[PDB]
Amino acid sequence: QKGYLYGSGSATSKEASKQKALADLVASISVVVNSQIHIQKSRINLKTDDLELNNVEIVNQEVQKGIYYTRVRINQNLFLQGLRDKYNALYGQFSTLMPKVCKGVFLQQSKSMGDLLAKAMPIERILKAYSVPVGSLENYEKIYYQNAFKPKVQITFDNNSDAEIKAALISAYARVLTPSDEEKLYQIKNEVFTDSANGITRIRVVVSASDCQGTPVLNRSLEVDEKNKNFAITRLQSLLYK
Numbered sequence: 001q002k003g004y005l006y007g008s009g010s011a012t013s014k015e016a017s018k019q020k021a022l023a024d025l026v027a028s029i030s031v032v033v034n035s036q037i038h039i040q041k042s043r044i045n046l047k048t049d050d051l052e053l054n055n056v057e058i059v060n061q062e063v064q065k066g067i068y069y070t071r072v073r074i075n076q077n078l079f080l081q082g083l084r085d086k087y088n089a090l091y092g093q094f095s096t097l098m099p100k101v102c103k104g105v106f107l108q109q110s111k112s113m114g115d116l117l118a119k120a121m122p123i124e125r126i127l128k129a130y131s132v133p134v135g136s137l138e139n140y141e142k143i144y145y146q147n148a149f150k151p152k153v154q155i156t157f158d159n160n161s162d163a164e165i166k167a168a169l170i171s172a173y174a175r176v177l178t179p180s181d182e183e184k185l186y187q188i189k190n191e192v193f194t195d196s197a198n199g200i201t202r203i204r205v206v207v208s209a210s211d212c213q214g215t216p217v218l219n220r221s222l223e224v225d226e227k228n229k230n231f232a233i234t235r236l237q238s239l240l241y242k
Contacts, residue, residue, distance in 0.1 A: 003076030005029050010069045017068035024071050037129040046122045054082055083123050084132055090120045094140055103231040104185020110148040111238040151181035158191045172227040176234050193228055
């Protein structure tokens, strides 16, 4: 009950009006919120967006001569409860991302943990600044730095292959991975003919979650690209049309 925040907008379309008014409402709440953490910090950082809200009230709607106007508001307390909720949903989504069938994690499952922790911390900063509970991420962070940032995956090669480019590969693999030798964690087999062929599988199972890359440009060390291109591959497999 204690508080109601407003937002309002006008556009040559009813829908566009609605949208300009939410935007303006989120924008308006960011302010009240940022300066609440500012009048708390022991001495507009975070900018909220629709993701953070739900189904808010329409207080005015007018239309005249082609322009539409919409004004919206939301209860401050319902707004916080909704943050408590998106947070709780983030927390219990993390638990479904941890170690599991192995001790090791792999790419997307890691990127996702990174994302949750990145959405959660700001939400949590807000919540603590208003004296709502939920206490701690510290534990999850630990679990993240010790299993998921990177992380550690074994990297195998073939009885022959070759070193430099093998080096090139491990080097690129490394801007995303931490080559490890400990077991009970995801593997990535390799075979390089002139251009690689890559396997994923994890502990207890051979879940093949991997494809095979090539680039016939043979110009010696100047084929640095199987690397320069391998990154871009492995990155955009964290879910981005691969």
